[PDB]
Amino acid sequence: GIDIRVARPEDAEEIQIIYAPIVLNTAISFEEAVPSVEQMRERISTTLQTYPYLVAVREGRVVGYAYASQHRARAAYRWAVDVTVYVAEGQRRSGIARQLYDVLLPVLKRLGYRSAYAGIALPNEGSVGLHERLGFQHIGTFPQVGFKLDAWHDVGYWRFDFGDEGLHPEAPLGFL
Amino acid sequence: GIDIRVARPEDAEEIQIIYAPIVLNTAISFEEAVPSVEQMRERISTTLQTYPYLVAVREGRVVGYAYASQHRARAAYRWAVDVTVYVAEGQRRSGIARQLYDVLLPVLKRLGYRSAYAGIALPNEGSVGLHERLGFQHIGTFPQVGFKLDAWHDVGYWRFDFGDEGLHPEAPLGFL
Ligand SMILES: CP(=O)(O)CC[C@H](N)C(=O)O
Ligand SMILES: CP(=O)(O)CC[C@H](N)C(=O)O
């Protein structure tokens, strides 16, 4: 009942089940083509080489996942990280989401990142409240920055601060 | 006498001369490695395959350049584009920058983009005023997102709305 494990490439099929509808029918993800199970399988592997990738299991099945990712490419951005959480289309009011974050965030802090950023396609008052009750501060919005499903969607950014200012290179999740 | 030209890889050298010290000792660019002339020569070629790359020439020399680049990776971001302008560290109080934007922006609009974004490392009253008097809206700031030269830097984003809501795929600057 909502236990959080480190993900694995074998969990690709159940992560795709969650992600496929989001891509086809929502503007939650700004992708337009559904990645295959094998494609999701390479993503998980690639991510785990440097970043945490978590899954939330319930009754022995994956009902949610969360992974971190590079914020930007330039060197001076290395203490910044993107965070991404998708719960399965129904077991929300989450819950699963807050928990996935309750594990992902402290692990991020340990590795040395100073800030975490979440992209939230607007409107999504449910997703917004979640982040804001975790401590995320809204720091900006890119209006009409994207076009999907015959509509112009804004993208807002929420920052989670870890603090600090001594500056040493962010270590990676033990290179899986 | 302040003339705006479409860049070509032969301008690589003079582009670096402007850009190399900016990387070494400013927070304007978050690159840490100083790019060579060959590296810059490949960036110009690659950019010109899809995006406009401009230079400002006066007295037969480059005094400012400007280029467009992909804003984000995912498909629904395809009508959004990043903009970058660097002028010569002695020919500023520009001038040059305004003339670059006077050319770059309308090209972008005719290419089918709906919004252009400029990322400004803060503080910079010089660059901020420029964008504000051109029509850019401040849409947010990423606080302490970068660390370089023993200091944490905020990055601001300014948006230039081209308008429209009919949505046809952005065309490239007549590919090389
Ligand atoms: C709108 P987008 O595709 O940029 C980000 C999607 C999701 N919120 C995430 O955190 O990955
Ligand atoms: C403020 P800046 O000039 O470093 C922008 C960096 C670039 N967006 C990135 O991909 O890191």
Author numbering:
A (entry chain D), B (entry chain A): 4 to 179
Q: Could you give the paper's own sentences about this structure?
A:
The arsN1 gene encodes an N-acetyltransferase that confers resistance to arsinothricin with high selectivity over the related antibiotic phosphinothricin. Here we show that ArsN1 acetylates both AST and PPT but with higher affinity for AST, indicating that ArsN1 is an AST-selective N-acetyltransferase. PpArsN1 forms an asymmetric homodimer in solution, as shown by the extensive interactions of the subunits and size-exclusion chromatography, similar to related N-acetyltransferases.
L-PPT is bound in two conformations. In one conformation (PPT-1), the orientation of L-PPT is similar to that of L-AST, although the sets of amino acid residues used by PpArsN1 to interact with each chemical moiety in L-PPT are slightly different from those that interact with the corresponding chemical moiety in L-AST. Another conformation of L-PPT (PPT-2) is similar to that of L-PPT observed in the previously reported coenzyme A- and L-PPT-bound ShPAT (PAT from Streptomyces hygroscopicus, also known as BAR). In contrast, the orientation of PPT-2 is inclined at 120° towards the AcCoA binding site with respect to those of PPT-1 and L-AST. Given the shorter distance between the amino group of PPT and the acetyl group of AcCoA in the PPT-2 conformation compared with the longer distance in the PPT-1 conformation, it is reasonable to propose that PPT-2, and not PPT-1, is a conformation that the enzyme assumes during catalysis. The side chain of Asp85 is not long enough to catalyze deprotonation of the α-amino group of L-PPT in the PPT-2 conformation. In contrast, in the PPT-1 conformation, the distance between the α-amino group of L-PPT and Asp85 is shorter (4.9 Å), allowing Asp85 to form a coordination with the amino group of L-PPT via a water molecule. This suggests that substrate deprotonation is catalyzed by Asp85 in the PPT-1 conformation.
